Amino acid sequence: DHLKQEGKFTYLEKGEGTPIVILHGLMGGLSNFDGVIDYFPEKGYKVLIPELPLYSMSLLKTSVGTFARYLKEFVDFKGYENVILLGNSLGGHIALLATKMFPEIVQALVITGSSGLKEIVDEVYETVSDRNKLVKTLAIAKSAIRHNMAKDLPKMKTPTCIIWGKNDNVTPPEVAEDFKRLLPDADLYWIDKCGHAAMMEHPEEFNQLLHEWFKERDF
């Protein structure tokens, strides 16, 4: 597991087999996914965690659509014909939009505590006093909600795994079942006593749930 910087792309890379591209949210450090980074590369998977240009994208090309196209540019750069997308919070929304815009590049979609329907405190105050980053955060939120997925979901054919905390406060469990309803080919699994970051709160069960879903479908 080492950090790569090739061109404008900064990303973590570990593993060799089937590529899993991970999209974290705004809160996201990469410590969110240590569970995934330790488990799946030893199970024959390639884990890639690219750093999206959330707050760097010009004064104003900052939209969910831009991040999705950035993801596409990353996969194309890597030369993959298809990947597995794993997304959390805003990252899940980026992944969803990417699967909508470029379905032929996505083998499967894994979603957990995503939008589209402790000491982190010190990096949300960053948003409210950074001065020029608040606008970008506001730009993202405006772009995100304007870009609702509810209408696009009914036939995003790609196989989708939805893993959710049974007591999520940010994105309530109702949202998870909405995803299950609209998506034509999706499976829903819950994790009890778990909030918005199943990956981090329970990397144990998340890995096992996700791994078994992969086994059933050959992913």
- 3-class SS string, the chain: CEEEEECCEEEEEEECCEEEEEECCCCCCHHHHHHHHHHHHHHCEEEEEECCCCCCCCCCCCCHHHHHHHHHHHHHHHCCCCEEEEEEEHHHHHHHHHHHHCHHHEEEEEEEEECCCCHHHHHCHHHHHCCCCHHHHHHHHHHHHHCCCCCCHHHCCCCEEEEEECCCCCCCHHHHHHHHHHCCCEEEEEECCCCCCHHHHCHHHHHHHHHHHHHHHCC
CB-facing half-sphere around the CA of 119: CA atoms within 13 A = 2
**φ, ψ dihedrals at 156, nearest 5°:** -95, 90
Nearest to residue 103, comparing CAs of 66, 72, 148, 73? 72
Residue 169 CB partners (closer than 8 Å, separation 6+):
195, 196
Q: How was this structure determined?
A: X-ray
Sheet holding 186-191, edge to edge: 2-6, 9-15, 45-50, 18-23, 83-89, 106-114, 160-165, 186-191
**φ, ψ dihedrals at 128, nearest 5°:** -90, -5
Residue 166 CB partners (closer than 8 Å, separation 6+):
173, 190, 191, 192, 193, 194
* Structural domains of the chain, with CATH: 1-219 (3.40.50.1820)
Assess contact for 219 and 18: CB atoms under 8 A.
yes
Residue 71, token pair as written in the block: 């993801």
First to last CA, the chain: 22
In residues, how long is the chain? Answer: 219
CB-facing half-sphere around the CA of 57: CA atoms within 13 A = 21
**Cross-strand partners of 187:** 161
Assess contact for 63 and 137: CB atoms under 8 A.
no
Residue 134 CB partners (closer than 8 Å, separation 6+):
127, 128
Residue 156, token pair as written in the block: 């995003």
